[PDB]
Symmetry: C3
Subunit: 283 residues, 3 copies
Amino acid sequence: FSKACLKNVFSVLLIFIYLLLMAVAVFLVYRTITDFREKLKHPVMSVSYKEVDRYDAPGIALYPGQAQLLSCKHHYEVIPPLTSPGQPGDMNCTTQRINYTDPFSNQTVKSALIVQGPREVKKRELVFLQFRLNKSSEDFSAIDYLLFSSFQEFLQSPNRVGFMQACESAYSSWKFSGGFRTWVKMSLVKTKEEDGREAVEFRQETSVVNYIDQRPAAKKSAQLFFVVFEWKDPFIQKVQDIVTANPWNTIALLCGAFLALFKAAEFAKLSIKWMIKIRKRYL
Amino acid sequence: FSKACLKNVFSVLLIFIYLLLMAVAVFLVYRTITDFREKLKHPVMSVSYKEVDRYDAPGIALYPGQAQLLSCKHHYEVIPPLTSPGQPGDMNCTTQRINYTDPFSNQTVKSALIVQGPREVKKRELVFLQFRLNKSSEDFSAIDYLLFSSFQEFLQSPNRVGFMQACESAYSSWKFSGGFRTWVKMSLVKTKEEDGREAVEFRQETSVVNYIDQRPAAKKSAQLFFVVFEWKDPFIQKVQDIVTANPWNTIALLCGAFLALFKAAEFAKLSIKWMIKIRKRYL
Amino acid sequence: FSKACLKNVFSVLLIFIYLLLMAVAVFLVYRTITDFREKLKHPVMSVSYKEVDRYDAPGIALYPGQAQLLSCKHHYEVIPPLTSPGQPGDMNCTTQRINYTDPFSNQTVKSALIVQGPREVKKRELVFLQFRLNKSSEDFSAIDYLLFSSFQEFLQSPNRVGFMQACESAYSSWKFSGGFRTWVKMSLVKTKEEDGREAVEFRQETSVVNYIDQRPAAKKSAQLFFVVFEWKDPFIQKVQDIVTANPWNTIALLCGAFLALFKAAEFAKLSIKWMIKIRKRYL
Ligand SMILES: *[C@@H]1O[C@H](CO)[C@@H](O)[C@H](O)[C@H]1NC(C)=O
Ligand SMILES: *[C@@H]1O[C@H](CO)[C@@H](O)[C@H](O)[C@H]1NC(C)=O
Ligand SMILES: *[C@@H]1O[C@H](CO)[C@@H](O)[C@H](O)[C@H]1NC(C)=O
Ligand SMILES: *[C@@H]1O[C@H](CO)[C@@H](O)[C@H](O)[C@H]1NC(C)=O
Ligand SMILES: *[C@@H]1O[C@H](CO)[C@@H](O)[C@H](O)[C@H]1NC(C)=O
Ligand SMILES: *[C@@H]1O[C@H](CO)[C@@H](O)[C@H](O)[C@H]1NC(C)=O
Ligand SMILES: *[C@@H]1O[C@H](CO)[C@@H](O)[C@H](O)[C@H]1NC(C)=O
Ligand SMILES: *[C@@H]1O[C@H](CO)[C@@H](O)[C@H](O)[C@H]1NC(C)=O
Ligand SMILES: *[C@@H]1O[C@H](CO)[C@@H](O)[C@H](O)[C@H]1NC(C)=O
Ligand SMILES: *[C@@H]1O[C@H](CO)[C@@H](O)[C@H](O)[C@H]1NC(C)=O
Ligand SMILES: *[C@@H]1O[C@H](CO)[C@@H](O)[C@H](O)[C@H]1NC(C)=O
Ligand SMILES: *[C@@H]1O[C@H](CO)[C@@H](O)[C@H](O)[C@H]1NC(C)=O
């Protein structure tokens, strides 16, 4: 009746209390393990993928030098035929300009043009950029570009100079050539270091397409650069410490270890009792 | 004797029965967990690789437009020197032609030429294709291609039109340029969605090689396209829900949780008995 | 006092002995499982990443044929402007030459030039190579290259001929074109087979940049090849058998299975005692 129900309730709450205590002990051991692992250098890391409905707009830092940005536009899955190559027109995108001292030599000041990238991967959104360089005594006509995760973070950055140097430290620098159109499909990788900081890196796939110049031969001295930026897939890659990335495996291992210790203690007590009984029976 | 053996057999079969019951309960809990997980959106997914002796022949959907397929051939690890570039000859491969309305605009009807790809990765099998385009008023001379997993599935597809649209929805579209030879190394990725459907995607690595035209200057108006398709490695990538991909980790976690619950119940019973005995001894 | 301390010490050492025995049994079962898995063909494999402070210098096997290696140099993050393209000069790197019969046809003897690659990824170390080919009646001007893990291993190899054939068996062969500069970012993948042997493979990302030739028109007959080699990131990928790569998950599963078996045995004994008591009470 009432007494049996009260006893059952007391037993259930005591079970819950002991479960809470066991969870606390297991969590403390896991916290100790993670604290030890965080101070290791070069640990083994695991990989995971996560799908996104829409991407945060990335930042494309271009280094045209003397080349003038002729045109930048947003398109969906297709680029309409060029109205007049080599002519300025239709320049309407979110762009910023930043000068910063190169972190590797300190002799050269890099001037970068930051462009907001595309967001809608599931609609094949494209950012199409056209540059024109009048003349250059240098060989290997190319424009260098760099990719970073967020344009908004750069916009609200307190420094905006150390941000660009930190971006240059990342391994996301490439070049695209003149006289060609480069289709770039970018992929996002995020690595979680033991300090808690996130390092963002970009993979790329490229398609290089020759450009046919029907402009007059007198106008062929200038060089035209065409580049297209889009997201390859809605999957973001995440590299994280193998123990920290999957806490549940370590929790299961620790629970098994504790239960094994309890079992071993019970067997030791049983063996002690057995030996005591054997000694008593013998003498 | 007989009685002891019978008792031992009964105990062993009872142990097996209880093990079956525990396995049934653990499987039911795992099934409930997976049913909950399947209705989540954008979960964390794990990656695995599997080696294959031979590949299923893929489907290469090319969009030449006005370009004529001059030649297609299968080679092993090397391509013999061209007998006569720009001339038709040696066109012998499994090819099919399909017209379908583009799923993104519905104004344009895409005409695709499907080619059966290579299978023997361990023999470096190559599919070599040569196209020729007489003239084109458009710039950016390129031919678009798409990759899908199985040519046989397309061959036996009941629709053959929705199949191509679904393939176009996948993120496996690229282009290759004229006046160059493009060596394409493809890699296969298969993603298992929670609905049970498999999404197939292709990664690519490209080598672009300039083509030297020794044909007469009067014949240089036409543009030549050369493309090579082969498998990069015998490893197929598989991306799957992290809980579903490794059921054994979840099984171990659930077994540990159940044993912890049993241990907690035993400790609660022991504590109840201890307190009852203490109360009896005190008064 | 002394007796209680001695009893506690004996109990603790017996607990340790039983824990050692349980660990031995679990390790034996895991060893049996791994021995069974090692004889499987095409198993499921997991992936992990490991960071490195510095890379072991790789081996770049180039196949110039009739092209002469004009220049090879080591640079950090930037290549100074060319003093005089097409002219020999500044050839100072660790290079070796090897002839070996091709393992696929045995009719052709491949002559390879091995170059020691870069090591310091965190300093963006670059290996820059320039070749010059006087004339060639063949089309598709390209130079084939292959990548292998260690130059030192090739240097101390007892055979040096079977080593190159085994390297050619690996899926790390590409080409780079003349009249262009190819920036190659390489990534290292190591696969552990069940036999214990390690297979090394290379991924690559390429940037192709057009080269502007201001040399006199009489000197344009020769073709110039420019290639740059560097490491993309300090992360090495490792693909290994899923059971062997994460032994701790299997250890946790086996510990849970053993504890479940012990629990089932205890429940069977309790049920046997219950039924015996019920039979005694009834009659
Ligand atoms: C495009 O440019 C025009 C003028 O250059 C501007 O008024 C318009 O807002 C721009 N649209 C977008 C989407 O950038
Ligand atoms: C940045 O440097 C460029 C020259 O490279 C020049 O426009 C000026 O010095 C700087 N621009 C601004 C807006 O500070
Ligand atoms: C360049 O200047 C920066 C900041 O003053 C310094 O940290 C770096 O060591 C310098 N590099 C040299 C002197 O090579
Ligand atoms: C530089 O480019 C402009 C295009 O904005 C062109 O009008 C001008 O003629 C070019 N300079 C020379 C010297 O041709
Ligand atoms: C190659 O083509 C010829 C005729 O064009 C045909 O008879 C032969 O069967 C073809 N072989 C292959 C392997 O496609
Ligand atoms: C497909 O379209 C092409 C024109 O693009 C033309 O051959 C014809 O209309 C269609 N071919 C077939 C076989 O239905
Ligand atoms: C194109 O037509 C298809 C099928 O009729 C339709 O689903 C799609 O919304 C249309 N797109 C438009 C009207 O932009
Ligand atoms: C079109 O290509 C064919 C090759 O099949 C060639 O004979 C013909 O002359 C070309 N057309 C023109 C107008 O040159
Ligand atoms: C560069 O070459 C010169 C002579 O060609 C040689 O003396 C020097 O040791 C070389 N340095 C390096 C770093 O290879
Ligand atoms: C290797 O072959 C080349 C010709 O391809 C020639 O130098 C010679 O036969 C061999 N060289 C050496 C050093 O054995
Ligand atoms: C080429 O020679 C090698 C070694 O003698 C042999 O293993 C291979 O089968 C040969 N290939 C042929 C005859 O096609
Ligand atoms: C071959 O190349 C050399 C450069 O070392 C050059 O001097 C020579 O003239 C070339 N041969 C011919 C036939 O031009």
